[PDB]
């Protein structure tokens, strides 16, 4: 199905033979089920979960009630997962990191680090024009953006400067190294999106 978890930086695990494997430490606290959606009401089968612990004055009544229907404590934020026919869950149930004890590889979704207004060189890997040899005010500029009379227009999806990052991106099939049940961790190989403290949706690899 999937679990929500805060990113907690990066480390490495040294395997006894020698290999140091760079790991992302994802803390995965008790993901508790706030709602179960089904074909009768909603037209599709899913579960809504929560995690963390939001202070009571910061949570609003419309959500405070929403948690009181389940009976769970008010976690910081809500996420939904689609069920794969066979599995079935109940409201108020706490899903733990022990689901990933069986799996080998995981898709990790997160929000990428925001680079702000990025130019074409940074954003699209556009090539810098000649740094000298006569060049006039046009070193890192994008160059041409179209043809002439014929279109007489720039085409849609033309790679230009603009907002880079702060976008939801998914890194697929990362190898799970260790699944610590006691501290509630999930060590995956490689790097996943977003900064330390960002929320990650970790789930089993679709590309088996």
């Amino acid at each position: 199905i999937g679990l929500v978890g805060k990113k907690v930086g990066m480390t490495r695990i040294f395997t006894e033979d020698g290999v140091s494997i760079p790991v992302t430490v994802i803390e995965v606290e008790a993901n508790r089920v706030t709602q179960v959606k089904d074909l009768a009401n909603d037209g599709y089968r899913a579960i809504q979960v929560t995690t963390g612990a939001k202070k009571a004055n910061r949570v609003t009544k419309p959500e405070a009630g929403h948690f009181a229907k389940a009976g769970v404590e008010a976690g910081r934020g809500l996420w939904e997962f689609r069920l794969a026919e066979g599995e079935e869950f109940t409201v108020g149930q706490s899903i733990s990191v022990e689901l990933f004890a069986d799996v080998k590889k995981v898709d990790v979704t997160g929000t990428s680090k925001g680079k702000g207004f990025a130019g074409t060189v940074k954003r699209w890997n556009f090539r810098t024009q000649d740094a000298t040899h006569g060049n006039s005010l046009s070193h890192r500029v994008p160059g041409s953006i179209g043809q002439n009379q014929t279109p007489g227009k720039v085409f849609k999806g033309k790679k230009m400067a603009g907002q880079m990052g702060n976008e939801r991106v998914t890194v697929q099939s990362l190898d799970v190294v260790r699944v610590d049940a006691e501290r509630n961790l999930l060590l995956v190989k490689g790097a996943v999106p977003g900064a330390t403290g960002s929320d990650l949706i970790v789930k089993p690899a679709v590309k088996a």
Binding site: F155, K156, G157, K158
Partner: protein
């Protein structure tokens, strides 16, 4: 001496049902567009939507002559750099069977605010059930 024009507020609009099972697409679509526009009515005014609400059910079973089941293509552009999509009459019914009647009628309606207003009148359905039992929509042929 100022000839009659239909005043929207006074327009008494009627509800109808059409079973499109085994009907010819275009010959259905025409008779639909004639009604939706309100041509059949004797108080027809071209600038007012005098036509009737129609419920076309069993849209997926609509018939087409010759080899148009495979050969008829529904092109459209995505508004993108080179994004011309196409779909044959089979492929269209496989995915979106409502679109077939929709597109055929929309081509035969006028083009503009009122033409779009008189398309809203049309209610297409893939299945045989319709949830507009509340209007007592009478049977049409």
């Amino acid at each position: 001496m100022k000839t009659f024009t239909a005043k929207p507020e006074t327009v008494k609009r009627d509800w109808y049902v059409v079973d499109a099972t085994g009907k010819t697409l275009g010959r259905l679509a025409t008779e639909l567009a004639r009604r939706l526009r309100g041509k059949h009515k004797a108080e027809y005014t071209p600038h007012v939507d005098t036509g009737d609400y129609i419920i076309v059910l069993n849209a997926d079973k609509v018939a087409v002559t010759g080899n148009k089941r495979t050969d008829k293509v529904y092109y459209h552009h995505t508004g993108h750099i080179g994004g011309i999509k196409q779909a044959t009459f089979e492929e269209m019914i496989a995915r979106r069977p409502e679109r077939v009647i929709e597109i055929a009628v929309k081509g035969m309606l006028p083009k503009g605010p009122l033409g779009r207003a008189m398309f809203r009148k049309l209610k297409v359905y893939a299945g045989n059930e319709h949830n507009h039992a509340a209007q007592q929509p009478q049977v049409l042929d």
